């Protein structure tokens, strides 16, 4: 037997036309909900996704009320009602993660059965079911339960065009004198504290709704005496949004020549890179089931070169 | 033979009383200088450090020009002269990181033989010299190159006495009704992000002027049958501040006898946590030798418990 990375359980009537308004393929969540309701029925539905997306079924009129989920704010239980002919959506009513509550009803024929929906994650991708004249059927489109949320699959397609501006900085400079007819040896070391810096572009409140990692490697400059290119380091998992502390260390003997001056100037080399990337959202389930949404962003970094030195005798 | 985690070469004469105005102890470090110059001599000093502390060498006067180093800016180089008759410290010029200036001398004696110091890291900690009337012979200690620095033996000397307080959240709501005659068995799953923080307190600057790191577990609660105590989880590196995320999951069967309503309610666990810590800074240097600095301050955090659920009959 087979698991599903989604969930839906529809409650109402047969009639009506097929309708669904899923964010499943970008995984863009349900950010906006507004339910008219008539005498025996809910009457429409408008609803927004948080990639923008916006669409109604049945029809709506003045007596719509609304709910916005804050972000991080998710689905904690859910009621559908049937209308008591069983031939219509009766009655919404859900209660967030926030404790905030929701319900829309039919006025005249009173609440008769309530169907209380598994929410799965509480995650949810939208809505699907049949409407004409009113909403004659509906469920809520959840993710089941999540177990992981990673972005991978990691591309840089425009990276092997462009070339790196690496810009130099000094780090230290010392001077060593020799007055002697010996050939003096010194000793130079010099430290540099810094900080790289990772961040990938994310839109639709992914960010907010799942917790997010990214399976990748980082773009990172690399040393040709030709100038120098981007290449993509060693894989690895980071958070979305990642800086990286570390300190910079060079030491090298100095040979100082009879009756002569050797000046030293340490440097590094640091590079700001922007560019944009591709990429693969998997949501993974407890069930074992996965839901894979195609991504594209920018990146912006920050990344250093190895230290290195000038020796210059005068 | 012999290394040492600072460097320090005094320029000047050999007349007037010794003085030493030194960060070493507690790490703290130059935030700013201001020098006085007359005709033939720098005639005073005075040195704050991030800690506070501020002091006064020589005779200062209207003529007075300052420095002040911003957070994470460090000094690149420095030049020291005598005066000329070598009997008093003559100028004072330095360059940092970030290539601000700062040069003050001897407004009519000509500047001779430049003394080009070895600043090591670059992280001052203050100066030590010989003055009277004027300054004599002056020169700033350093911190030798830097190879790492590091928070550990992290101690909560109060954990024991405070009892942490675990706030409960509802997570997800679920029924099951068994209304056949034989016992049904269902599979409950629930997941939710979480977001825990980690935050150790710092002074004088320390977090701007080092790359720190903490060797430490981070404090966790625990389930006594009391109810729930404070532990320090397994040990590890970690940035100053820092936060993680991650889906926190549950799965079981659920057992519903015939013609019985099991409610399933999971649930989540939330401690905020504010507990005094001491620890050691130890900075080790390029060289091998290295510097430590007992530390006192707060750490705050954001932990939770396991999911849980509760199954109630009906």
């Not at 309530?114 to 994650?121: A, L, P, Q, R």
């Not at 960010?207 to 030709?226: C, D, H, Q, R, Y």
Request: glycine share 10%; net charge negative.
């Amino acid at each position: 037997h087979m698991v599903y990375p989604t969930t839906l359980h529809i409650i109402g009537g047969q009639g009506g036309n097929a309708f669904s308004f899923n964010g499943q393929e970008n995984a863009a969540t349900l950010q906006k909900l507004s339910v008219s309701v008539g005498g025996w029925q809910v009457r429409g539905v408008q609803v927004w996704l948080t990639d923008g997306r916006r669409e109604t079924f049945g029809a709506m009129d003045s007596s719509a009320k609304e709910f916005e989920f804050e972000s991080g704010e998710f689905i904690k239980s859910l009621s559908l009602w049937g209308n008591g002919a069983g031939t219509r959506l009766g009655a919404i009513k859900f209660i967030t993660s926030r404790s905030r509550e929701f319900f829309a009803k039919m006025t005249d024929w009173g609440l008769k059965t309530e169907y209380k929906i598994d929410v799965g994650s509480g995650i949810c991708l939208g809505v699907q079911g049949r409407g004409g004249s009113d909403i004659d059927s509906m469920g809520f489109i959840f993710i089941n339960a999540i177990k992981s949320s990673v972005i991978q699959d990691m591309k840089y397609p425009t990276m092997h065009q462009i070339l790196p501006n690496v810009q130099m900085e000094e780090i230290k400079e010392m001077e060593y004198k020799n007055d002697t007819s010996i050939v003096q040896s010194y000793t130079f070391e010099s430290s540099k504290k810094i900080i790289k810096k990772s961040s990938w572009s994310t839109t639709n409140k992914i960010e907010s709704t799942f917790s997010l990692s990214v399976k990748a490697g980082i773009p990172e400059v690399m040393e040709v005496e030709t100038g120098f290119s981007f290449t993509v380091g060693s894989e690895s998992t980071h958070a979305v949004e990642e800086s990286e502390e570390k300190t910079e260390t060079l030491t090298f003997p100095v040979t100082v020549p009879t009756h002569k001056t050797v000046t030293v100037v340490a440097n590094i080399g640091r590079a700001d890179i922007d560019l944009p990337y591709t990429a693969l959202l998997r949501i993974t389930c407890v069930n074992g089931a996965s839901l894979d949404a195609p991504l594209s962003g920018i990146y912006k970094g920050l990344t250093y070169t190895k230290m290195t030195a000038v020796a210059t005798e005068s």
